[PDB]
């Protein structure tokens, strides 16, 4: 409703770096807000793409940003009659970023890994890896839970069970309020998908450079399955956290599986032990139900509600014809111990191939009326196909069916305006929560400042 579309702020990165693929707000120890931006194709040391991270200080006029430096050199360790190898070429550092407290977590989902022993090997595969930083102190750490030292022959002899060689850990990420990092790894267990969790404090205290294979005892990984419904499910394509079991001491996980059960798609809610509390099935095959998940109480009853995006949903139209426009589902959490029922509201895109629901960002209370609001991106929507972001306001009965405001992309065609979103933080300290929007196709980020209601 009250975001300012006239005076925008623009941040820019190098051409071709995909600056803006991911982003988040960051507060330093003093509360000063800044923006952390990932650029998955930033050039590295050997003039080859490795990805990179930028930490942009807030400035009305925007501009260029300084780098948040990480080690980009391939590593090798000869130990235990084996050879450990990391490969950072095209690892996509900054494909996801998230901030908690005064720490930044940036992931490289496609970092490759291998282990040699005489003539045998584990196989060169994308286990993924996460880089952690405390910018003010300079502390650095890494976390790569899918690394292993088992030889290829052993996996074959055991029927490829508990095979975490293609996890792509860091594909999606999120941190609990208590400081527990949760990683989505849609390629885990031979493409079923898994989740990896460990306290940030324990990631730092147990990490040392040059080791490559170390233990984080307080970590916990999800489990393999023999149920074909989960095969090629990409469980962990997206992740989020929230409170869905009435017990405030426990934190529940929300996980997207966009191709679950033969591309039907699903979203599951779990406890911290990966036991399933609820499952939400997709409505239409190949719609990618679960591509994105967002948790937030929109109807102001103190109970977290769930939003699911299905960017490839095809709406029915005149003459038995289907039109790919995308759809978003709203599930309100009921009182007491009960299961989430049918969705309370269905929002459906209008522009063909617009991919409405590719991203969903909680905005907090934009217009300050007492109800939390959300933003939905359609990165190829709008009458010109340049991309659009739609704002929906919360209400006692859930969400308004019509958007209160629409943001047309200020960038050229193909910028992917809205592919990444993040709100609910007041960056200029004017009392109103603001929205940042990534456009990796243009290598830029746009900041929309909220203003008093007109």
């Amino acid at each position: 409703l009250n975001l300012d579309p006239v005076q925008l702020t623009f941040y820019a990165g190098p051409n071709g770096s995909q600056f803006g693929f991911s982003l988040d707000f960051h507060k330093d120890s003093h509360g000063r807000v800044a923006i952390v931006v990932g650029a998955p194709r930033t050039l590295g040391p050997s003039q080859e793409e490795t990805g990179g991270v930028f930490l942009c200080p807030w400035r009305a006029e925007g501009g260029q940003c300084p780098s948040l430096l990480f080690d980009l050199r391939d590593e090798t360790r000869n130990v235990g009659s084996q050879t450990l190898q990391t490969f950072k070429a095209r690892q996509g550092l900054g494909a996801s970023v998230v901030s908690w407290s005064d720490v930044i977590v940036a992931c490289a989902p496609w970092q490759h890994w291998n282990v040699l022993e005489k003539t045998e090997e584990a196989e060169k595969t994308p286990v993924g890896s996460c880089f952690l930083a405390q910018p003010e102190s300079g502390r650095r750490a890494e976390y790569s839970p899918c690394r292993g030292n088992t030889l290829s022959r052993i996996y074959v002899e055991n029927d490829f069970s508990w095979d975490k060689r293609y996890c792509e850990a860091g594909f999606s990420s999120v941190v609990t309020q208590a400081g527990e990092l949760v990683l989505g790894a849609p390629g885990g267990y031979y493409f079923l998908g898994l989740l990896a969790q460990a306290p940030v404090a324990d990631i730092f205290s147990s990490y040392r450079p040059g080791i490559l294979l170390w233990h984080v005892s307080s970590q916990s990984l999800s489990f393999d399955s023999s149920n074909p419904e989960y095969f090629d499910g990409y469980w962990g394509y997206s992740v989020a956290v929230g409170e869905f079991d009435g017990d405030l001491n426990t934190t529940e996980y929300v996980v997207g599986a966009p191709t679950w059960s033969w591309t039907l798609g699903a979203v599951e809610i779990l406890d911290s032990y990966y036991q399933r509390l609820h499952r939400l099935r997709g409505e239409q095959m190949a719609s990618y139900f679960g591509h994105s998940v967002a948790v937030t109480d929109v109807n102001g009853d103190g109970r977290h509600d769930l939003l699911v995006g299905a960017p490839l949903y095809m709406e029915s139209r005149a003459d038995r014809k289907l039109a790919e426009v995308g759809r978003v589902y709203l599930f309100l959490q009921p009182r007491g111990p009960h299961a989430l029922g049918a969705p309370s509201l269905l929002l459906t895109g209008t522009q063909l191939y617009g991919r409405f629901g590719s991203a969903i960002a909680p905005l907090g209370d934009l217009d300050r009326d007492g109800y939390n609001d959300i933003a939905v991106a359609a990165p190829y929507g709008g009458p010109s196909g340049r991309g659009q972001v739609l704002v929906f306001l919360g209400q006692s009965e859930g969400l308004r069916s019509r958007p209160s405001q629409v943001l047309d992309s200020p960038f050229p065609t193909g910028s992917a305006f809205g592919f990444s979103l993040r709100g609910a933080v007041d960056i200029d300290d004017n009392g109103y929560p603001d929205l940042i929007v990534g456009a990796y196709g243009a290598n830029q980020v746009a900041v929309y400042r909220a203003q008093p209601v007109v």
Epitope: R77, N78, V79, S81, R208, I211, L213, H215
Partner: antibody, heavy 119, light 108 residues
Framework: EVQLQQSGAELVKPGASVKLSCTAS????????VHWVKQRPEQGLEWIGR????????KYDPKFQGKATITADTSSNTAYLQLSSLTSEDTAVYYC????????????WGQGTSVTVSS | DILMTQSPSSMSVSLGDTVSITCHAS??????IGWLQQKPGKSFMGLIY???NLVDGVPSRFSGSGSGADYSLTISSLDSEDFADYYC?????????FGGGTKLEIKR
Amino acid sequence: EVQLQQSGAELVKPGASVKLSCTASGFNIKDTYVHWVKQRPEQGLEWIGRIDPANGYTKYDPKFQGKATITADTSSNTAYLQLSSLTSEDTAVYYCVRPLYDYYAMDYWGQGTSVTVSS
Amino acid sequence: DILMTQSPSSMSVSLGDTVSITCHASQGISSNIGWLQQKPGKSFMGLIYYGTNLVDGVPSRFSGSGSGADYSLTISSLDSEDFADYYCVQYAQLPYTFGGGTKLEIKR
């Protein structure tokens, strides 16, 4: 806290066998590698082998091949070292060992189990 | 099998002194070495891993150094509890192998 409680001192005759144990305390035995080391006053420390309780795969120093057998039962969170055809040279103190962070290190140690062979 | 030559076999020193134990492998082990402590009539305790990294709980007066096939364990300002046996161990190659050991004795 991580602690390794080994079994009590054993006392057996030559030619017989014995099975020592190493129970994990404060953690899951399946977390890391588990090693067995032999200590003697004159000879010193010698590495016997390791086991990965998760799957059961083992490695041995060829010197102890046939004499030593390492196993583990995740159900009881315990690792075992079985010795056979016991002789006087087998008289030593045996320790169970696991790493702290580094996969290949040797940081935590059990209190040690004493074995004595005599007729 | 890699041989770990540890020296000296023993040394007589006093409290507050700074002493250094050395270990020499028969070949390069690239910091894949650990240092151990065994107090008289007791089990072992980990001191160092991967050459220079202190095991949790170990005082900072202990420190490891070296590279290639030569490494060192140093105790700055000896404490009354530090008088014990020390052993080095390499895990660059299986089977793991230990050093001869070093006994720190009280001087008088």
